[PDB]
Amino acid sequence: MDAFQGILKFFLNQKTVIGYSFMALLTVGSERLFSVVAFKCPCSTENMTYGLVFLFAPAWVLLILGFFLNNRSWRLFTGCCVNPRKIFPRGHSCRFFYVLGQITLSSLVAPVMWLSVALLNGTFYECAMSGTRSSGLLELICKGKPKECWEELHKVSCGKTSMLPTVNEELKLSLQAQSQILGWCLICSASFFSLLTTCYARCRSKVSYLQLSFWKTYAQKEKEQLENTFLDYANKLSERNLKCFFENKRPDPFPMPTFAAWEAASELHSFHQSQQHYSTLHRVVDNG
Amino acid sequence: MDAFQGILKFFLNQKTVIGYSFMALLTVGSERLFSVVAFKCPCSTENMTYGLVFLFAPAWVLLILGFFLNNRSWRLFTGCCVNPRKIFPRGHSCRFFYVLGQITLSSLVAPVMWLSVALLNGTFYECAMSGTRSSGLLELICKGKPKECWEELHKVSCGKTSMLPTVNEELKLSLQAQSQILGWCLICSASFFSLLTTCYARCRSKVSYLQLSFWKTYAQKEKEQLENTFLDYANKLSERNLKCFFENKRPDPFPMPTFAAWEAASELHSFHQSQQHYSTLHRVVDNG
Amino acid sequence: MDAFQGILKFFLNQKTVIGYSFMALLTVGSERLFSVVAFKCPCSTENMTYGLVFLFAPAWVLLILGFFLNNRSWRLFTGCCVNPRKIFPRGHSCRFFYVLGQITLSSLVAPVMWLSVALLNGTFYECAMSGTRSSGLLELICKGKPKECWEELHKVSCGKTSMLPTVNEELKLSLQAQSQILGWCLICSASFFSLLTTCYARCRSKVSYLQLSFWKTYAQKEKEQLENTFLDYANKLSERNLKCFFENKRPDPFPMPTFAAWEAASELHSFHQSQQHYSTLHRVVDNG
Amino acid sequence: MDAFQGILKFFLNQKTVIGYSFMALLTVGSERLFSVVAFKCPCSTENMTYGLVFLFAPAWVLLILGFFLNNRSWRLFTGCCVNPRKIFPRGHSCRFFYVLGQITLSSLVAPVMWLSVALLNGTFYECAMSGTRSSGLLELICKGKPKECWEELHKVSCGKTSMLPTVNEELKLSLQAQSQILGWCLICSASFFSLLTTCYARCRSKVSYLQLSFWKTYAQKEKEQLENTFLDYANKLSERNLKCFFENKRPDPFPMPTFAAWEAASELHSFHQSQQHYSTLHRVVDNG
C-alpha cells in the first residue's frame, strides 16, 4: 500500500551496512565448510606449510576478486597508454595515489574478515604453529612439560604422541587460545585504523556537509541518465545502418561527439571552490 | 483499513524504546554464541589475558561501530580543516564540547550492554580472576581452603586439580557469584547516571516544553524537504549537461548558491531567545 | 463491518486494566527466567549479599525506567532553570509537590509487582535469610534442631550438610514458606494503600463527576490538534526557507508567537471554579 | 509492480558473476559424484595411469565443449577458405592472433576450475602419486619409514599392506596434503594471471572508458535489430515463393544485397580514432 515502501526506504538508506553484514555472514559460514570437511592436519615436517596456506591463500583470492568487482578501478585505467597525462595531471599530480589508495583499502576488507574468523576458530594456527622448529617461540609453548615437547610437538594435533595424554590436551588448549587472542587483536586494530583514515578524509574535504550531500545525489543521477542516453542513441544508429544495408541506399549523417571530446570527459575530477563543478562532464560543458 | 494504522501510530511514537529493546535482545543472544561455541578456558598463566579479552574487545568494537553510524558526527567534522572557526565559534566556544559529549554518551550504550550481560553469565570473569597472582584479592577467594589454593587456583575451571572436588565445586560457585554482583552494580549505576545527565540537560534548556515540541517537528521535516530539493535540482542539472555534450551546443546558465553560502548554512546551531531561529538555514535566510 | 468495532470499543474504554494485566504477565514470566537459568546460590558468607541483589536491583532499574517513560515528568521540568517561579507559583505553592507525588506513585507500581512475584517464588529469600548471622531472628528458624543449625545454616540450600537430611528438607520448607507469607502481606497492603490515596484525591476534587468527564475529553483532544498544527506550520516554514536559499531571494515574514507567549502557555494548570478553564492554553487565550 | 523489476536490474547488470558462480557450483558437485561412486583405485602397476586419467580427461572434454558454445569462434571461421585475406587483413595482420587468444583464454576457465576442485579433494592424486617408480620424488614421501615403502607403496590406498598400520595412516595423510597444497597454488596463480591479462588489455585500449561503454551498448542492440530484420525479410520472401508456385505465376523481383556486400559486412573489426566506426557494418554503410 503505502507503508511497505516506507520501510523499504529504511532498508535502502542504510544500504552500506547490510552489504558488510552479509559479507561477514558469508565468510563465517564458508570457513566452517573448510575446517570441517577439507582440513585435516598431517603430523609431519610439512605442518608449517600446510596450515599457513589455508590461512593466507583464500585471502589472496579475495583480494584479487576485489579488484575485478570495483567499478572505479576500470574508469581510471581504461585507455591509459594512449595518453598517460590524463591520469597524472600537471596541476594535481598526487590525486593518482589518492584514488589508487581508495581501491586498495576498499578491497582489503574481505581479506581481513577472513583472517579474523580463521584465527578465532583456531584450527589453522594450531596445525601451523606446532611444526615451528625455532629456538625462541618454543619455550613459550613448552614450559612445564617433559623433554619430548622439543622433538615430538608436531604430532599433538593428530594425537598419538606418547607423553601422558593429560599433557596432550593442555598443549592443544594453549595453542588454541593464542590464536583467539591474535584473532581479536586484528579486529580491534583494523576497526581503529579504518575509522582514523575515514575521519581524516572527511576532515580535509574541500566542501562542507551540505554541499557534499548534493554532490552525491548528482553523481548517482548522472549514471542513470547516461545509461538512458547511450541506449537512446544506439537504437537510432542501428536502425539507420540496417535500412541502408538492405535497401542499398546512402545514409544521412549522424551527429556524434568527436574523439577529442570523448577523451576530455573521461579524465579525473578534483573539486575547485572557485568554479564549483560536480563532475568532469560538467566541466567540459561549462568551459566550451 | 483504518484501525491498523491507528496502532502503527502507537508503534511509531514510541520508536526510541523498540530500538533499545532490540539492541539488548541482540547482545544477549550473541553472548551465548560466544561463551558456548568459542570460549574454552585454558589452565595456564595466560588465564588473565584470555578471559579479559573476551570481556573488553567486543566492547571496543561496538564503541567504534557507534561512531560510524552516528549521523551528527559527520555533520560536525566534514570540511573541518578548511575553516576551523565555524566549529569553534567566538560567541559560544563551549558548544563544541557539548555536542562532542553527545556522540560519546550515545555510543557508550552498546558497550555497557555488553559488559553487563557478559558478567551476568559469569564464565569470562571466572577464567580471568582465577589466574590472579596477587597478595590481596586472593585471600578473599581462598579463605577456608587447603594450602594448594594459593598455587593451583588457575586449574579450577578445567578440572584436573587434586583437592577433593567438593572443594573444587564451591570455588566455581564463589567466583561465578562475584561476577553476577558486579553485573548488577553496573546496570544500576549506569541507569542512574543516564537519568541524571538527561534530566540536567532538560532542566537547563533554553525553551519550555511546548516550544521544544515544535522545534523537533520542524527539524524532522527540514530533512524530508532537503532530500526532495536536492533530487529536483540534480535531475534538472544532469539533463542540461547530457544534451549539450551530444549536440555540441553551449548551455544556459544554472543558478546555484555561492560557495560562501554553502559554508554558512553548514555551521553549528545555538538557540537565542531574542531572535528565535530553529535551524542554521533559518538564520541565513532571515538575516540576508 | 460494524460489530467488530463495537467490541473494539469495549477493549478501548477499558484501556487502563489491560496495561496493568500485561505488566503483571511480563513480570511473572521474566522472574522465571532469572530463578531458573541465572540464580545459583553459593553456600558462603556472601549469601546475604547475593540474594539481596537479585531481589532489589531489578526493582531499582524498573523504577528509573518509569521516570523515562512518564510523559508528564518532562512537561514539568523542561526549561526549569530559565525561570523557576513558573513551577513554584505564588498562589498555589504546594501544587509542585502534588504533581511530583503523582510521578512517584505511578512509577512505583512495577517495582512492587517485582518484589511480590520474587517473594512468592521463595528462592531469593531462602538464599538471603540462610546467611543471617544474627542473635535474634535465628532462633525462630532453628528451634527444635541440633546444635549445628547455629553454624552450618548457610549450606542448607546447596546441600552438603551433615545433619540428617530429613532435617535439611524441613529447614528448606520453613524458609520457603516465610517468604510466601511476606509475599502476600505486600500485595494486600499496597492494594489497600493504592485505593486509599485514589479515593482521597477524588473526594477532594474541585469539580463534580460530570465536569471532570468533559475535562478529560478536552485534554485528550487538545493533544491531537496540537500535533496537527505543529505539523502544518512546519511544512509551511521549511518550504519558505528552501526556496529563498536556492533562488537567492528575500523571504516574506512568518507570523509566529513571541517567546513571552510560548513560555506562558507551558505553566502548571490549577482549576478555579470562578473562571472555569480546562487548560493553561485556554487561560492565556481567554485572558489576552 | 516496479520494485520487483528494480531488483531484477541488480541481478542483470551483474550477469557475469552469476554465470561464473554457477559454473563453480556445478564443478564442485559433479566432482563428488565421480570420486564417491565411480572412482575405486586398484593397487597395481596401473595406478599411475588410472588416477591421471580421472584428473585430466574431464578437463580435456570441458575445453572442447568451450569451443562449441563460443559464439565468436564461428563468426571468425565460417567461409574462411573462400577468401582467407579477410581474416588476415593487410593493415593489421596481428588481430587474428589477438582474437584467437581471446577464445582460448575464455574457454580455459572451466578446465582450471576442474583441476582445482579435484586436487583439493585429494583422492585422484593419492592414487596417481603412489605408483610413482622414480629415484627422486620417492624419498620425499618415504623418509622415516621402513624398507618396504620403496616396494609396497602402491598398496597404501586399498589398505592391506603389512607395514604396521599406524604407518599406513600417516602415509595416506602425507599424500592427501601434498595435493591440497598444489590445489591452492593453482587457484592463486591463475587468478593472478587472469587479472594481469585483463588489466593489460584495458590499459592498451584505443578508447577511453566512456566511449567503450557506448560501443558495448551499440553492439548489443545490433544483434537484436538484426534478428528482427532477418525475420521480416524471410516472411516476405516465403510468402512470395509459395503463391507463385501454386498459382503458376511469375514473381516480382526481390531486392536483396549482393554477394560482394554480404562478404564485406562479415569481416573483422578494428577501431580507428580517425573515423570512429563501432561495427564493420557501420563501416560499409558510411563508406559506400
GROMACS .gro file of N, CA and C in nm, chain A residues 5 34 38 40-42 44 46 49-50 53-54 57-58 60-61 64 67-69 74-75 77-82 86 160 226 230-231 233-235 237-242 244-247 250-251 256-259 262-263 265-266, chain D residues 3 17 166 169 173-174 176-178 180-181 184 187-188 191-192 194-195 198-199 202-214 217-218 221-222 225-226 229-230 233 255 257 261-262 265 273 276 278 281-282 284-286 288:
model
  336
    5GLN      N    1   0.645   0.042   0.125
    5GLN     CA    2   0.754   0.115   0.062
    5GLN      C    3   0.816   0.218   0.155
   34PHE      N    4   3.536  -2.538   0.540
   34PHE     CA    5   3.673  -2.576   0.512
   34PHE      C    6   3.738  -2.649   0.628
   38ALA      N    7   3.740  -3.027   0.470
   38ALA     CA    8   3.862  -3.036   0.391
   38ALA      C    9   3.990  -3.036   0.471
   40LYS      N   10   4.248  -3.146   0.731
   40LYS     CA   11   4.295  -3.245   0.828
   40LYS      C   12   4.446  -3.239   0.830
   41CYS      N   13   4.501  -3.202   0.944
   41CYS     CA   14   4.642  -3.174   0.955
   41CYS      C   15   4.721  -3.304   0.947
   42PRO      N   16   4.830  -3.309   0.873
   42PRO     CA   17   4.925  -3.419   0.887
   42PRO      C   18   5.005  -3.400   1.016
   44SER      N   19   5.369  -3.419   1.016
   44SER     CA   20   5.497  -3.432   0.950
   44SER      C   21   5.574  -3.302   0.966
   46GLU      N   22   5.580  -3.101   0.722
   46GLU     CA   23   5.504  -3.011   0.637
   46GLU      C   24   5.382  -2.955   0.707
   49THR      N   25   5.391  -2.546   0.634
   49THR     CA   26   5.344  -2.505   0.503
   49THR      C   27   5.195  -2.531   0.485
   50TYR      N   28   5.144  -2.641   0.542
   50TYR     CA   29   5.006  -2.681   0.515
   50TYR      C   30   4.906  -2.591   0.585
   53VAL      N   31   4.889  -2.217   0.439
   53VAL     CA   32   4.828  -2.197   0.308
   53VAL      C   33   4.677  -2.183   0.322
   54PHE      N   34   4.615  -2.260   0.411
   54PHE     CA   35   4.473  -2.245   0.438
   54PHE      C   36   4.439  -2.115   0.509
   57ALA      N   37   4.607  -1.821   0.159
   57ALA     CA   38   4.570  -1.832   0.018
   57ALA      C   39   4.423  -1.804  -0.013
   58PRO      N   40   4.324  -1.834   0.073
   58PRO     CA   41   4.191  -1.777   0.049
   58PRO      C   42   4.182  -1.627   0.073
   60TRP      N   43   4.434  -1.420  -0.047
   60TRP     CA   44   4.489  -1.366  -0.171
   60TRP      C   45   4.388  -1.371  -0.284
   61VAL      N   46   4.298  -1.468  -0.282
   61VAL     CA   47   4.196  -1.479  -0.385
   61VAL      C   48   4.086  -1.376  -0.363
   64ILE      N   49   4.215  -1.031  -0.497
   64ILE     CA   50   4.214  -1.017  -0.642
   64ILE      C   51   4.071  -1.012  -0.694
   67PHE      N   52   3.951  -0.649  -0.686
   67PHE     CA   53   3.992  -0.559  -0.793
   67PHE      C   54   3.908  -0.577  -0.918
   68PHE      N   55   3.850  -0.696  -0.937
   68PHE     CA   56   3.763  -0.719  -1.052
   68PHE      C   57   3.629  -0.648  -1.035
   69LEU      N   58   3.570  -0.656  -0.917
   69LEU     CA   59   3.435  -0.605  -0.894
   69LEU      C   60   3.431  -0.458  -0.860
   74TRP      N   61   3.838   0.040  -1.318
   74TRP     CA   62   3.836   0.036  -1.463
   74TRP      C   63   3.817   0.172  -1.525
   75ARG      N   64   3.751   0.264  -1.455
   75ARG     CA   65   3.738   0.400  -1.506
   75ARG      C   66   3.870   0.473  -1.506
   77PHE      N   67   4.178   0.324  -1.540
   77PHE     CA   68   4.285   0.260  -1.614
   77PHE      C   69   4.255   0.234  -1.761
   78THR      N   70   4.130   0.246  -1.806
   78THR     CA   71   4.098   0.217  -1.945
   78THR      C   72   4.151   0.327  -2.036
   79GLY      N   73   4.225   0.287  -2.139
   79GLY     CA   74   4.283   0.383  -2.231
   79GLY      C   75   4.401   0.458  -2.175
   80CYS      N   76   4.472   0.398  -2.079
   80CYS     CA   77   4.579   0.468  -2.009
   80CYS      C   78   4.701   0.490  -2.098
   81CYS      N   79   4.740   0.390  -2.176
   81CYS     CA   80   4.863   0.400  -2.255
   81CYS      C   81   4.848   0.484  -2.381
   82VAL      N   82   4.727   0.532  -2.412
   82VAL     CA   83   4.711   0.626  -2.522
   82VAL      C   84   4.772   0.760  -2.486
   86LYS      N   85   4.656   1.225  -1.878
   86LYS     CA   86   4.521   1.248  -1.828
   86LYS      C   87   4.496   1.178  -1.695
  160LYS      N   88   4.827  -3.938   1.925
  160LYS     CA   89   4.928  -4.043   1.911
  160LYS      C   90   5.069  -3.990   1.934
  226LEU      N   91   2.296   0.873  -1.810
  226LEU     CA   92   2.393   0.831  -1.910
  226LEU      C   93   2.360   0.694  -1.966
  230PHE      N   94   2.276   0.667  -2.375
  230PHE     CA   95   2.353   0.571  -2.453
  230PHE      C   96   2.263   0.469  -2.520
  231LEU      N   97   2.147   0.441  -2.461
  231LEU     CA   98   2.054   0.343  -2.515
  231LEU      C   99   1.952   0.406  -2.608
  233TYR      N  100   2.058   0.670  -2.821
  233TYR     CA  101   2.139   0.698  -2.938
  233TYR      C  102   2.195   0.572  -3.003
  234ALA      N  103   2.171   0.455  -2.945
  234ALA     CA  104   2.214   0.330  -3.006
  234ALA      C  105   2.102   0.257  -3.077
  235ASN      N  106   1.977   0.279  -3.037
  235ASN     CA  107   1.865   0.234  -3.118
  235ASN      C  108   1.852   0.317  -3.244
  237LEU      N  109   2.094   0.463  -3.411
  237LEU     CA  110   2.204   0.441  -3.504
  237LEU      C  111   2.195   0.306  -3.572
  238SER      N  112   2.151   0.203  -3.500
  238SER     CA  113   2.142   0.071  -3.561
  238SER      C  114   2.023   0.060  -3.654
  239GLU      N  115   1.918   0.140  -3.633
  239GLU     CA  116   1.808   0.144  -3.729
  239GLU      C  117   1.850   0.210  -3.859
  240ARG      N  118   1.940   0.308  -3.851
  240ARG     CA  119   1.988   0.375  -3.971
  240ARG      C  120   2.082   0.285  -4.050
  241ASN      N  121   2.159   0.200  -3.982
  241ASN     CA  122   2.258   0.118  -4.050
  241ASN      C  123   2.195  -0.001  -4.121
  242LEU      N  124   2.087  -0.057  -4.067
  242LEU     CA  125   2.029  -0.176  -4.127
  242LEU      C  126   1.939  -0.143  -4.245
  244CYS      N  127   1.998   0.107  -4.458
  244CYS     CA  128   2.084   0.145  -4.568
  244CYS      C  129   2.172   0.031  -4.615
  245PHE      N  130   2.162  -0.086  -4.552
  245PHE     CA  131   2.232  -0.205  -4.598
  245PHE      C  132   2.143  -0.294  -4.684
  246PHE      N  133   2.017  -0.310  -4.648
  246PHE     CA  134   1.927  -0.395  -4.724
  246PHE      C  135   1.862  -0.324  -4.841
  247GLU      N  136   1.853  -0.191  -4.838
  247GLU     CA  137   1.792  -0.116  -4.947
  247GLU      C  138   1.893  -0.057  -5.043
  250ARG      N  139   2.218   0.543  -4.949
  250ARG     CA  140   2.318   0.623  -4.880
  250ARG      C  141   2.256   0.685  -4.756
  251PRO      N  142   2.327   0.690  -4.644
  251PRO     CA  143   2.266   0.734  -4.518
  251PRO      C  144   2.282   0.883  -4.493
  256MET      N  145   2.755   1.280  -3.377
  256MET     CA  146   2.815   1.222  -3.258
  256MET      C  147   2.932   1.310  -3.215
  257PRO      N  148   2.969   1.310  -3.087
  257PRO     CA  149   3.083   1.391  -3.043
  257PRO      C  150   3.215   1.339  -3.099
  258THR      N  151   3.311   1.430  -3.110
  258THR     CA  152   3.440   1.396  -3.168
  258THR      C  153   3.521   1.312  -3.069
  259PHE      N  154   3.632   1.257  -3.119
  259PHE     CA  155   3.719   1.178  -3.033
  259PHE      C  156   3.790   1.265  -2.930
  262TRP      N  157   3.542   1.300  -2.648
  262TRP     CA  158   3.519   1.176  -2.574
  262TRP      C  159   3.631   1.151  -2.474
  263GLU      N  160   3.751   1.200  -2.503
  263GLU     CA  161   3.866   1.179  -2.417
  263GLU      C  162   3.874   1.281  -2.305
  265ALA      N  163   3.610   1.419  -2.146
  265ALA     CA  164   3.507   1.388  -2.049
  265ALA      C  165   3.527   1.255  -1.980
  266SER      N  166   3.649   1.200  -1.986
  266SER     CA  167   3.683   1.076  -1.916
  266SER      C  168   3.804   1.094  -1.826
  867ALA      N  169   0.913  -0.236  -0.790
  867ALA     CA  170   1.028  -0.273  -0.708
  867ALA      C  171   1.077  -0.414  -0.736
  881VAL      N  172   2.900  -1.246  -1.300
  881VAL     CA  173   2.946  -1.310  -1.177
  881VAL      C  174   2.850  -1.417  -1.128
 1030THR      N  175   4.968  -4.796   1.173
 1030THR     CA  176   4.983  -4.655   1.208
 1030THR      C  177   5.073  -4.585   1.108
 1033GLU      N  178   4.846  -4.495   0.805
 1033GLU     CA  179   4.756  -4.382   0.820
 1033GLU      C  180   4.826  -4.249   0.800
 1037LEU      N  181   4.803  -3.955   0.479
 1037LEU     CA  182   4.786  -3.814   0.512
 1037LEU      C  183   4.897  -3.727   0.457
 1038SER      N  184   5.013  -3.783   0.429
 1038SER     CA  185   5.119  -3.702   0.371
 1038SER      C  186   5.105  -3.691   0.220
 1040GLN      N  187   4.767  -3.696   0.083
 1040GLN     CA  188   4.643  -3.621   0.070
 1040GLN      C  189   4.662  -3.474   0.103
 1041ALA      N  190   4.773  -3.438   0.168
 1041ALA     CA  191   4.804  -3.299   0.199
 1041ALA      C  192   4.900  -3.235   0.101
 1042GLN      N  193   4.973  -3.313   0.022
 1042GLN     CA  194   5.052  -3.256  -0.086
 1042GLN      C  195   4.967  -3.217  -0.205
 1044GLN      N  196   4.645  -3.091  -0.167
 1044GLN     CA  197   4.573  -2.972  -0.128
 1044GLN      C  198   4.663  -2.849  -0.124
 1045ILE      N  199   4.794  -2.867  -0.125
 1045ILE     CA  200   4.884  -2.754  -0.142
 1045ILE      C  201   4.897  -2.719  -0.290
 1048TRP      N  202   4.582  -2.529  -0.410
 1048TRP     CA  203   4.577  -2.386  -0.382
 1048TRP      C  204   4.681  -2.306  -0.458
 1051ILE      N  205   4.482  -2.212  -0.787
 1051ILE     CA  206   4.382  -2.106  -0.779
 1051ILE      C  207   4.449  -1.971  -0.758
 1052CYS      N  208   4.566  -1.969  -0.696
 1052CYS     CA  209   4.630  -1.843  -0.662
 1052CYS      C  210   4.714  -1.786  -0.775
 1055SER      N  211   4.435  -1.692  -1.081
 1055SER     CA  212   4.362  -1.569  -1.053
 1055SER      C  213   4.451  -1.447  -1.071
 1056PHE      N  214   4.580  -1.460  -1.044
 1056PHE     CA  215   4.673  -1.350  -1.065
 1056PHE      C  216   4.706  -1.332  -1.213
 1058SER      N  217   4.496  -1.409  -1.457
 1058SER     CA  218   4.374  -1.361  -1.521
 1058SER      C  219   4.353  -1.212  -1.501
 1059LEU      N  220   4.404  -1.157  -1.391
 1059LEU     CA  221   4.394  -1.013  -1.370
 1059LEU      C  222   4.498  -0.937  -1.450
 1062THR      N  223   4.380  -0.912  -1.830
 1062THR     CA  224   4.267  -0.822  -1.847
 1062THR      C  225   4.309  -0.677  -1.825
 1063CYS      N  226   4.393  -0.652  -1.725
 1063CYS     CA  227   4.439  -0.516  -1.699
 1063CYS      C  228   4.534  -0.465  -1.806
 1066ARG      N  229   4.302  -0.360  -2.116
 1066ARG     CA  230   4.232  -0.234  -2.098
 1066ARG      C  231   4.326  -0.115  -2.092
 1067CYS      N  232   4.450  -0.135  -2.047
 1067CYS     CA  233   4.546  -0.025  -2.046
 1067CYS      C  234   4.589   0.012  -2.187
 1068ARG      N  235   4.584  -0.082  -2.281
 1068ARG     CA  236   4.621  -0.058  -2.419
 1068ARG      C  237   4.499  -0.054  -2.510
 1069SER      N  238   4.385  -0.010  -2.458
 1069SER     CA  239   4.267   0.009  -2.539
 1069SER      C  240   4.282   0.134  -2.624
 1070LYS      N  241   4.201   0.142  -2.729
 1070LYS     CA  242   4.205   0.255  -2.820
 1070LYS      C  243   4.111   0.368  -2.780
 1071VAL      N  244   4.016   0.341  -2.691
 1071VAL     CA  245   3.917   0.438  -2.649
 1071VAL      C  246   3.921   0.449  -2.497
 1072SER      N  247   3.862   0.555  -2.445
 1072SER     CA  248   3.856   0.576  -2.301
 1072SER      C  249   3.738   0.499  -2.243
 1073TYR      N  250   3.706   0.522  -2.116
 1073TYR     CA  251   3.604   0.442  -2.051
 1073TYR      C  252   3.464   0.477  -2.099
 1074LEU      N  253   3.439   0.603  -2.131
 1074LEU     CA  254   3.304   0.643  -2.164
 1074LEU      C  255   3.267   0.605  -2.306
 1075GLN      N  256   3.364   0.605  -2.397
 1075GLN     CA  257   3.338   0.561  -2.533
 1075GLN      C  258   3.325   0.411  -2.543
 1076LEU      N  259   3.396   0.337  -2.457
 1076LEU     CA  260   3.383   0.192  -2.457
 1076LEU      C  261   3.251   0.146  -2.398
 1077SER      N  262   3.182   0.232  -2.325
 1077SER     CA  263   3.052   0.197  -2.272
 1077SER      C  264   2.940   0.224  -2.371
 1078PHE      N  265   2.963   0.311  -2.470
 1078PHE     CA  266   2.868   0.328  -2.578
 1078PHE      C  267   2.886   0.222  -2.685
 1081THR      N  268   2.701  -0.090  -2.570
 1081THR     CA  269   2.556  -0.078  -2.582
 1081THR      C  270   2.512  -0.087  -2.727
 1082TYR      N  271   2.595  -0.037  -2.819
 1082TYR     CA  272   2.561  -0.045  -2.961
 1082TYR      C  273   2.569  -0.188  -3.010
 1085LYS      N  274   2.263  -0.404  -2.926
 1085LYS     CA  275   2.140  -0.372  -2.996
 1085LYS      C  276   2.158  -0.367  -3.146
 1086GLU      N  277   2.268  -0.419  -3.198
 1086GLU     CA  278   2.273  -0.454  -3.338
 1086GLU      C  279   2.258  -0.604  -3.355
 1089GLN      N  280   1.840  -0.597  -3.339
 1089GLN     CA  281   1.779  -0.541  -3.459
 1089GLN      C  282   1.808  -0.626  -3.582
 1090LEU      N  283   1.917  -0.702  -3.581
 1090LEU     CA  284   1.949  -0.789  -3.693
 1090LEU      C  285   1.869  -0.917  -3.692
 1093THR      N  286   1.522  -0.798  -3.850
 1093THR     CA  287   1.521  -0.772  -3.993
 1093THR      C  288   1.528  -0.902  -4.071
 1094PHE      N  289   1.607  -0.998  -4.023
 1094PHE     CA  290   1.619  -1.128  -4.090
 1094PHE      C  291   1.488  -1.204  -4.087
 1097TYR      N  292   1.234  -1.006  -4.349
 1097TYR     CA  293   1.263  -1.031  -4.489
 1097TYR      C  294   1.254  -1.178  -4.525
 1119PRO      N  295   1.445  -0.732  -5.391
 1119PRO     CA  296   1.572  -0.661  -5.370
 1119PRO      C  297   1.645  -0.707  -5.245
 1121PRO      N  298   2.072  -0.771  -5.090
 1121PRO     CA  299   2.209  -0.726  -5.115
 1121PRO      C  300   2.288  -0.827  -5.197
 1125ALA      N  301   2.857  -0.757  -5.099
 1125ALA     CA  302   2.828  -0.681  -4.979
 1125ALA      C  303   2.785  -0.769  -4.862
 1126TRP      N  304   2.749  -0.894  -4.887
 1126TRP     CA  305   2.732  -0.988  -4.777
 1126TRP      C  306   2.866  -1.030  -4.721
 1129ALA      N  307   3.052  -0.712  -4.506
 1129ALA     CA  308   2.998  -0.686  -4.373
 1129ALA      C  309   3.017  -0.803  -4.279
 1137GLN      N  310   4.071   0.577  -3.451
 1137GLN     CA  311   4.028   0.701  -3.388
 1137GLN      C  312   4.016   0.817  -3.487
 1140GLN      N  313   3.551   0.707  -3.658
 1140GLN     CA  314   3.503   0.624  -3.548
 1140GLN      C  315   3.386   0.540  -3.594
 1142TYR      N  316   3.178   0.180  -3.507
 1142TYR     CA  317   3.156   0.090  -3.396
 1142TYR      C  318   3.122  -0.052  -3.438
 1145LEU      N  319   2.965  -0.335  -4.000
 1145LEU     CA  320   2.850  -0.296  -4.080
 1145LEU      C  321   2.833  -0.145  -4.083
 1146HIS      N  322   2.875  -0.076  -3.978
 1146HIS     CA  323   2.878   0.069  -3.978
 1146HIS      C  324   2.985   0.123  -4.071
 1148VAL      N  325   3.081  -0.030  -4.374
 1148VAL     CA  326   3.042  -0.049  -4.513
 1148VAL      C  327   2.924   0.037  -4.554
 1149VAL      N  328   2.857   0.102  -4.459
 1149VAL     CA  329   2.744   0.189  -4.489
 1149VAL      C  330   2.789   0.334  -4.501
 1150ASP      N  331   2.881   0.377  -4.414
 1150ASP     CA  332   2.935   0.512  -4.423
 1150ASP      C  333   3.028   0.528  -4.543
 1152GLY      N  334   3.023   0.384  -4.864
 1152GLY     CA  335   2.972   0.327  -4.988
 1152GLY      C  336   2.933   0.181  -4.977
   0.00000   0.00000   0.00000
